Write a protein that binds this ligand. Structure first.
Ligand code: NI
Length: 58
DNA sequence: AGAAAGCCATTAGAG
DNA sequence: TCTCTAATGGCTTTC
């Protein structure tokens, strides 16, 4: 498969949202997806991984 | 219900 | 070659 590298801007915006909502509703994923020029799935997967990054650091 | 979203462990593509 | 993390597959849980 192929892989896309997320810019400083995209990662920062994602991380910014994560401070407020650890989980996203479907309408908000699509918002961010458009705001960051990412697909819905990428926003879904990102938050999943970041939730995992957050549990270990606790 | 039954898809969609989650959890979680595991790969692998870029730089 | 190494490292970081985007993406994957299996299940189970949500709603
Ligand atoms: Ni069922």
């Amino acid at each position: 498969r192929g892989r896309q590298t997320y810019t400083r801007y995209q990662t920062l915006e994602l991380e910014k949202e994560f401070h407020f909502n650890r989980y996203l509703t479907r309408r908000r994923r699509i918002e961010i997806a458009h705001a960051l020029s990412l697909t819905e799935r990428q926003i879904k997967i990102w938050f999943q991984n970041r939730r995992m990054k957050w549990k270990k650091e606790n």
